[PDB]
Design a binder for this molecule. Structure first.
Ligand SMILES: *[C@@H]1O[C@H](CO[C@@H]2O[C@@H](C)[C@@H](O)[C@@H](O)[C@@H]2O)[C@@H](O[C@@H]2O[C@H](CO)[C@@H](O)[C@H](O)[C@H]2NC(C)=O)[C@H](O)[C@H]1NC(C)=O
Ligand code: NAG
Ligand code: CA
Ligand code: CA
Ligand code: CA
Ligand code: CA
Ligand code: CA
Lengths: 51, 192
């Protein structure tokens, strides 16, 4: 088991709507059929800074 | 054309077949009215007086009037929040400035919402919507039949070119939204 953090940089003039989605799936050389464990996606709300 | 009506005024047009009943609600309307002036003259002794008509301006507060229209196919509303409804013929319904409601009814109608936050119902038939790349948000329903929304009628303004450049619209009929100022404000969207 491996746990790690991946850092992202968000542009200050970004246009992502109000709802941004991230998608990730794992792969290996053994080349076996895809499964629900292999795929994951989660949804996060977005707000825009205003002054 | 009711384009002389101000922002505080409104009209409500209802169809009784081929005849139209128009209810005008004018708040603090300014109306000419004719009265009787009185000029007087003394002539060295006891006075002789006269009178005469005199048109003048006055504001008479709240007024409600019921106009009647026959054999009229096109109506233009004022600068207020109008409610305009058509009939089974082909109508030109324009709202002008303000948050107008336009309903065409049956037939092939042309619908111009103008400025403001308009709600526009086309009804049955093949209807035409004319838009102007404004800053407000509009609600548009086409109804039955094949309908068309057009954005090419108006030439783009100078400030539009300055703020946006050469970008126009992002339209998607699956989402049902048309973004007239993409990535500059998120609330200038027409819902179709
Ligand atoms: C505040 O805004 C939300 C979201 O509006 C949507 O996203 C904006 C970025 C902009 O693009 C808007 O034009 C979008 O509609 C409103 O919530 C939505 O409300 C509509 C109906 O009004 C509904 O169909 C959507 O499902 C709603 N979406 C969400 C995520 O809530 C909300 O109503 C606004 N608040 C006020 C007080 O107007
Ligand atoms: C991972 O997801 C992407 C989504 O574009 C897909 O193209 C790819 O085939 C997927 N790979 C696996 C191993 O599921
Ligand atoms: Ca109006
Ligand atoms: Ca009609
Ligand atoms: Ca209008
Ligand atoms: Ca119609
Ligand atoms: Ca229609």
């Amino acid at each position: 088991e491996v746990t790690f953090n991946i850092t992202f940089d968000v542009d200050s003039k970004a246009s992502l709507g109000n709802k941004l989605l991230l998608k990730a799936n794992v792969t290996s050389e053994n080349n076996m059929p895809r499964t629900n464990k292999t795929e994951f996606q989660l949804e996060l709300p977005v707000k825009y800074a205003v002054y | 054309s009711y384009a002389a009506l101000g922002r505080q005024d409104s009209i409500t047009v209802s169809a009784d077949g081929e005849r139209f009943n128009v209810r005008k609600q004018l708040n603090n309307a300014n109306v000419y009215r004719e009265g009787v002036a009185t000029q007087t003259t003394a002539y060295g002794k006891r006075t002789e007086n006269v009178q005469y008509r005199h048109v003048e301006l006055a504001r008479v507060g709240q007024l409600v009037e019921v106009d009647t229209l026959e054999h009229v196919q096109h109506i233009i509303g004022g600068a207020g929040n109008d409610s305009i409804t058509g009939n089974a013929h082909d109508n030109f319904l324009a709202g002008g400035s303000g948050d107008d409601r336009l309903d065409g009814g049956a037939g092939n109608d042309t619908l111009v919402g103008g400025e403001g936050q308009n709600t526009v119902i086309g009804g049955a038939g093949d209807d035409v919507f004319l838009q102007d790349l404004g800053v407000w948000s509009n609600q548009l329903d086409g109804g039955a039949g094949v309908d068309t929304v057009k954005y090419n009628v108006h030439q783009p303004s100078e400030e539009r070119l300055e703020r946006m450049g050469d970008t126009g619209i992002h339209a998607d009929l699956q989402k049902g939204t048309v973004e007239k100022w993409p990535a500059l404000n998120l609330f200038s969207v027409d819902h179709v």
